[PDB]
Amino acid sequence: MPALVIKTNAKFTEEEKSKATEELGNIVSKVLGKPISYVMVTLEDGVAVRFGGSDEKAAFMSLMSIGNRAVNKRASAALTKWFTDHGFQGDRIYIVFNPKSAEDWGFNGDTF
Amino acid sequence: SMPALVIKTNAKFTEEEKSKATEELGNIVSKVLGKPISYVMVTLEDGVAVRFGGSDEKAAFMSLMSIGGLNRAVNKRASAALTKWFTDHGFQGDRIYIVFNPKSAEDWGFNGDTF
Amino acid sequence: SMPALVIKTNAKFTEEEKSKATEELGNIVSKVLGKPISYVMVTLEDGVAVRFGGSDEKAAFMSLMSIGGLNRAVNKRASAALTKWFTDHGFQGDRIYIVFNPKSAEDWGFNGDTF
């Protein structure tokens, strides 16, 4: 099951945040080959961000999935496109990939 | 060697409710991990936009980091005890997400020094 | 080789204090890590419920991610330099908790591409 954690200094409305987690979650499902059921998306807006010395609009992202280099390039491009289509500049978008193991994952009070 | 629990959720808590939660969740981590009750760092972020399984219904994402001390047996006990806290406080156990991140001694800092 | 610093704290900052803080803390990361400020990313979330050592007194949790470039030798200088900022800005040094998490080149993304 993949997880996407997003921090940004942009301010979103509740409607914008709800739509965003839906669209970004659907992007993760398509690129990663998992059903939408397994996708967890977290969005924290209005956090103080400084990237390259500037506090201009920016976004930081971490993607955790239970089990590569090929997919990460594809994931990087698809997630960035959403932000560039919503007022962001592609050089202010930052993604970190952290794949994890089954025993290090919990759900419904049990591991895998 | 103090473990850390980082919690993000879309539920809305009052200030008193957040205060009780960090104490209770922290005490749970300490008991299961065999660490003293005090020696535990807990972070709780409420009111964050969360979507799990397509739904933005009440959900919680958690990361538990400990320098070692996270084998498969302990993780199952911690997952169960933490989930019990959430199911006892209005959550559904299938909306609770836990990640375990074992780490190294040189990769952990406290009081300006690593271990 | 861009570094990333993620900060959670229960202290309350004005917008100006947060703005000064991301600049000062970022410059520290650039200094300790030997990288230019152009490649440095800093995120600061204040007013999060934090309990460290049983107390909800002012405390801070930090994660520092760098593509390699993190031996224990740097980790101690980074831990000390980062802690000094907090002890100089109203925090107690034994309430400051830092995680170092080096990641691999294939595990890092920017501008739609990995390294």
Automatic annotation (TrEMBL), chain A:
It comes from the Eukaryota. The keyword Transferase does not apply. Keywords: Cytokine, Isomerase, Secreted. It is found in: Secreted. GO terms for molecular function: cytokine activity; dopachrome isomerase activity; phenylpyruvate tautomerase activity. InterPro entries: Macrophage_inhib_fac, Tautomerase/MIF_sf. GO terms for cellular component: extracellular space. Pfam families: MIF. The keyword Transport does not apply. It catalyses: 3-phenylpyruvate = enol-phenylpyruvate; L-dopachrome = 5,6-dihydroxyindole-2-carboxylate. Its EC number is 5.3.2.1, 5.3.3.12. Belongs to the MIF family. This is L-dopachrome isomerase. It comes from Trichomonas vaginalis (strain ATCC PRA-98 / G3).
Automatic annotation (TrEMBL), chains B, C:
GO terms for molecular function: cytokine activity; dopachrome isomerase activity; phenylpyruvate tautomerase activity. InterPro entries: Macrophage_inhib_fac, Tautomerase/MIF_sf. It comes from Trichomonas vaginalis (strain ATCC PRA-98 / G3). It holds the Pfam family MIF. It is found in: Secreted. Belongs to the MIF family. It catalyses: 3-phenylpyruvate = enol-phenylpyruvate; L-dopachrome = 5,6-dihydroxyindole-2-carboxylate. It is an enzyme of class 5 (isomerase). Its EC number is 5.3.2.1, 5.3.3.12. One of its GO terms (cellular component) is extracellular space. SUPFAM superfamilies: Tautomerase/MIF (SSF55331). This is L-dopachrome isomerase. Its main location: secreted. The lineage of its organism: Eukaryota, Metamonada, Parabasalia, Trichomonadida, Trichomonadidae.
